[PDB]
Design a protein around this ligand. Structure first.
Ligand SMILES: OC[C@H]1O[C@H](O[C@H]2[C@H](O)[C@@H](O)[C@@H](O[C@H]3[C@H](O)[C@@H](O)[C@@H](O[C@H]4[C@H](O)[C@@H](O)[C@@H](O[C@H]5[C@H](O)[C@@H](O)[C@@H](O[C@H]6[C@H](O)[C@@H](O)[C@@H](O[C@H]7[C@H](O)[C@@H](O)[C@H](O)O[C@@H]7CO)O[C@@H]6CO)O[C@@H]5CO)O[C@@H]4CO)O[C@@H]3CO)O[C@@H]2CO)[C@H](O)[C@@H](O)[C@@H]1O
Ligand SMILES: OC[C@H]1O[C@H](O[C@H]2[C@H](O)[C@@H](O)[C@@H](O[C@H]3[C@H](O)[C@@H](O)[C@@H](O[C@H]4[C@H](O)[C@@H](O)[C@H](O)O[C@@H]4CO)O[C@@H]3CO)O[C@@H]2CO)[C@H](O)[C@@H](O)[C@@H]1O
Ligand SMILES: OC[C@H]1O[C@H](O[C@H]2[C@H](O)[C@@H](O)[C@@H](O[C@H]3[C@H](O)[C@@H](O)[C@@H](O[C@H]4[C@H](O)[C@@H](O)[C@H](O)O[C@@H]4CO)O[C@@H]3CO)O[C@@H]2CO)[C@H](O)[C@@H](O)[C@@H]1O
Ligand SMILES: OC[C@H]1O[C@H](O[C@H]2[C@H](O)[C@@H](O)[C@@H](O)O[C@@H]2CO)[C@H](O)[C@@H](O)[C@@H]1O
Ligand code: CA
Ligand code: CA
Ligand code: CA
Length: 686
């Protein structure tokens, strides 16, 4: 099958996602609607259930609303059963309409539908070439109070109907009891509760095994991707072991929600996306786009800087999920704003690197403040809005032109208000011009591109006041006027002679697992696949065609490898780096080191005899470790994904910048559990 096939669960770069807030999209089955004080059929009270369900989504898939727009993927509110409580937060009733207050990760939220309904959704979507992503929020259960067990459902967690425990009298320590986070530090936000939500303790074996078994149930139901919620608030090491469980079973595109504020560039964020096994929602992209196209707090130079910086900071920038708004922030389109601002932001996002995700209702020019005002019921299913047409015209390009899906990004023309950028992959090219100034046109002279000589029509057909482009020899474009608010897209596609890799997924797994290599120019005959210097050919290459290769990871030592392929003739492709071969199945283990004193700025890290611990390379040591919440300085702790059942030697380090101080004595040693969790507690050796 080609890279663009709906069956490709490992690559969403050729797709356009539609963010569906289930309760607010379409009530296709009034019979499953909640009743009484928990429901408002008019959807005036945005904190109660309005009735939106999976049958509704199926209907909108079948009547062409989404397909007519060029949407090829959707994500939905967490499908698992939520609490049924109607919580009164200071005179206002609140329900779990949003799906984030889970009580049973192995059952469905009856308001959205039954397991049968979910199966029907997966089937209907796939029949229309639409992939399905589910939100999954394993960070917590629901609102709770340990002193007041009668409040809500006391954050109780059930295992397919069987009660495991609640927040009160939690002798099993299924949850954290460290108060609520104040977001002061990453550690603080991980081991303390978000709001009043009962924080799950992933170091508890029951919780660990339960959640991994739960996600596998959904994987078996045929989901195509996972949107991990609140990933900045769960142990990064545990999450890596979670992604390993997923990838070593049935790998599907996974990305997490890690909020970044305006002007926030986070090295931790980058590292997480680069080493966790999942990518992230591109807040850096979203926030900059809002600054430039919505709030006028930065110009095109800032947009360019974001594009160049992110392409260098994220190992796989093409896996970051882009957007201009979501279910938490104010909708991009302000009531009194010119609609062209939204239309340009959409065009920009749809033609830029990554995986575009459009919040439901954006195309209907919905406006709204922060939660819950940004969650109104979609007011119309009109295909006649300009925004709907913009998406309809550009979304399909991610499938037809690989430069959009996998291409590099290069600024070709720029000033305060104008940015003309080029996407290029193999012989494929796309050039996009955007003039955010709604009052002043710009004279574009001296524009040079990789487009072959010829005349190019605006893919938007002038919808956003674009124009035709005339390209002479050398890719030089004839002088033209870019209209005020003008947005144009010019593109070129052609066969690529040389094998070219545009995407690889998953990027982390143990040997034997099948990975998907997408691109162009692979040829129809099986070639060779390289993991570092190791060559793979023949039987282990399950399938091979021009745009997609399915190949099993060879039994090489755990570590980071460059991926490369060669066609049957022996011509080598470009290198796709940062592939992590795991040393085997993974388990999450908590390491605790006692009496490790340090100077301000100096932190403790973990190093060891397996790749999961950096193979004794301080530059790849695990950390910085924590020392405030679960354990207190001079004691440090950290949760780490390590190969199950392996005997591992390790030591702790104290690092100040790249300056390292090693534990003295012999290495510490332990054998990781075969499944579940474990805690290894040792003393710092001088
Ligand atoms: O021994 C003393 C005492 O200890 C214990 O009590 C402590 C608690 O255990 C501890 O958690 C802590 O609770 C307090 C909080 O720290 C504090 O912040 C405060 O919480 C308020 C909050 O400040 C209010 O704003 C309000 O919250 C609102 C939000 O503002 C709304 O936006 C909304 O939210 C929900 C969203 O609508 C949902 O979509 C979803 O959000 C998800 C996002 O959409 C998604 O993108 C993201 O990634 O993930 C999100 C989560 O899935 O869920 C949101 C949360 O439900 O609605 C909420 C609710 O109205 O209200 C909260 C609650 O009041 O006050 C807390 C109570 O004090 O501190 C306690 C005291 O130290 C013991 O439990 C106790 O018995 C002991 O006596
Ligand atoms: O995000 C919050 C902060 O995180 C990081 O801070 C960590 C430090 O870099 C790391 O050294 C350690 O800090 C411990 C000190 O090493 C240790 O000496 C002692 O600190 C003393 C201090 O020496 C003394 O001068 C002062 O009067 O009292 C301090 C005791 O509170 O304990 C420290 C731990 O409490 O761990 C820190 C994380 O907990 C970032 O480096 C920092 O910039 C962030 O603000
Ligand atoms: O990769 C080949 C070798 O791998 C393994 O060796 C690793 C060690 O097992 C591991 O402990 C660590 O070694 C560090 C020491 O633990 C640490 O004490 C220090 O050693 C200093 C020593 O303190 C000092 O007295 C002496 O003068 O210099 C030593 C350094 O040469 O740093 C060590 C790291 O440089 O990392 C080792 C890998 O680098 C296998 O155990 C070994 O058999 C293999 O040959
Ligand atoms: O002609 C090559 C040149 O094209 C672009 O330069 C633009 C510049 O961005 C505009 O602001 C204005 O000064 O016109 C120039 C072309 O004459 C590229 O930005 C530049 O890197 C490239 O060399
Ligand atoms: Ca319904
Ligand atoms: Ca947490
Ligand atoms: Ca890369």
């Amino acid at each position: 099958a080609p890279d663009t096939s709906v069956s490709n669960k490992q690559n969403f770069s050729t797709d356009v996602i539609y963010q569906i807030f289930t309760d607010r999209f379409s009530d296709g089955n009034p019979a499953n609607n909640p009743t009484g004080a928990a429901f408002d059929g008019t959807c005036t009270n945005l904190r109660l259930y309005c009735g939106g369900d999976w049958q509704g989504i199926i209907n909108k898939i079948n009547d062409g609303y989404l397909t007519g727009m060029g949407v090829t993927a959707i994500w939905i509110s967490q499908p698992v059963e939520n609490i049924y409580s109607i919580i009164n937060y200071s005179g206002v009733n609140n329900t779990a309409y949003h799906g984030y207050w889970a009580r049973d990760f192995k059952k469905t939220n009856p308001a959205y539908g039954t397991i049968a309904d979910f199966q029907n959704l997966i089937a209907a979507a796939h029949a229309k070439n639409i992939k399905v992503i589910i939100a999954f929020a394993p960070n917590h259960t629901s609102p709770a109070s340990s002193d007041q067990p009668s409040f809500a459902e006391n954050g109780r967690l059930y295992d397919n109907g069987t009660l495991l425990g609640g927040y009160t009298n939690d002798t099993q320590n299924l949850f954290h009891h460290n108060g609520g986070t104040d977001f002061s530090t990453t550690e603080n936000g991980i081991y303390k509760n978000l709001y009043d939500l009962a924080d799950l303790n992933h170091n508890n074996s029951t919780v660990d095994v339960y959640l991994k078994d739960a996600i596998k149930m959904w994987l078996d139901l045929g989901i195509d991707g996972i949107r991990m919620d609140a990933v900045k608030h769960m142990p990064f090491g545990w999450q890596k072991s979670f992604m390993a469980a997923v990838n070593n079973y049935k790998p599907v595109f996974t990305f997490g929600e890690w909020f970044l504020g305006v002007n926030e560039v986070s090295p931790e964020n980058h590292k997480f996306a680069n080493e966790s096994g999942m990518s992230l929602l591109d807040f850096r992209f979203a926030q900059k786009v809002r600054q430039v196209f919505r709030d006028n707090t930065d110009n095109m130079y800032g947009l360019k800087a974001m594009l160049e910086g992110s392409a260098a900071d994220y190992a796989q920038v093409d896996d970051q999920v882009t957007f201009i708004d979501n279910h938490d922030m104010e909708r991009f389109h302000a009531s009194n704003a010119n609609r062209r601002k939204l239309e340009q932001a959409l065009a920009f996002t749809l033609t830029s690197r990554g995986v575009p995700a459009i919040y439901y209702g954006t195309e209907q020019y919905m406006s709204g403040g922060t939660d819950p005002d940004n969650r109104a019921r979609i007011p119309s299913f009109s295909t006649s809005t300009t925004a709907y047409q913009v998406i309809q015209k550009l979304a399909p390009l991610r499938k037809s032109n690989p430069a959009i899906a996998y291409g590099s990004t290069q600024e070709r023309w720029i000033n305060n208000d104008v940015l003309i950028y080029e996407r290029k992959f193999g012989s494929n090219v796309a050039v996009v011009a955007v003039n955010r100034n709604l009052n002043a046109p710009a004279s574009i002279s001296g524009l040079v591109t990789s487009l072959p000589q010829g005349s190019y029509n605006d893919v938007l057909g002038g919808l956003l006041n674009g124009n035709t482009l005339s390209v002479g020899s050398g890719g030089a474009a004839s002088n033209f006027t870019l209209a005020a608010g003008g947005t144009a897209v010019w593109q070129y596609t052609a066969a690529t002679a040389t094998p070219t890799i545009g995407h690889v997924g998953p990027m982390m797994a143990k040997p034997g697992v099948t990975i998907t290599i997408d691109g162009r120019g692979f040829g129809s005959s099986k070639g060779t696949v390289y993991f570092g210097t190791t060559a793979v050919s023949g039987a282990d290459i399950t399938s091979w065609e021009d745009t997609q290769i399915k190949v099993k990871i060879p039994a090489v030592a755990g570590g980071n490898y460059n991926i490369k392929v060669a066609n049957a003739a022996g011509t080598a492709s470009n290198v796709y780096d940062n592939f992590e071969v795991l040393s085997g199945d993974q388990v999450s283990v908590r390491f605790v080191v006692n009496n490790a004193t340090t100077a301000l700025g100096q932190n403790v890290y973990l190093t060891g005899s397996v790749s999961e611990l950096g193979n004794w390379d301080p530059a790849k040591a695990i950390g910085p470790m924590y020392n405030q919440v679960v354990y207190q300085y001079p004691n440090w702790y950290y949760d780490v994904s390590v190969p199950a059942g392996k005997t591992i030697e390790f030591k702790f380090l104290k690092k100040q910048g790249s300056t390292v101080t090693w534990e003295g004595g012999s290495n510490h040693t332990f054998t990781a559990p075969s499944s579940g969790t474990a805690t290894i507690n040792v003393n710092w050796q001088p």
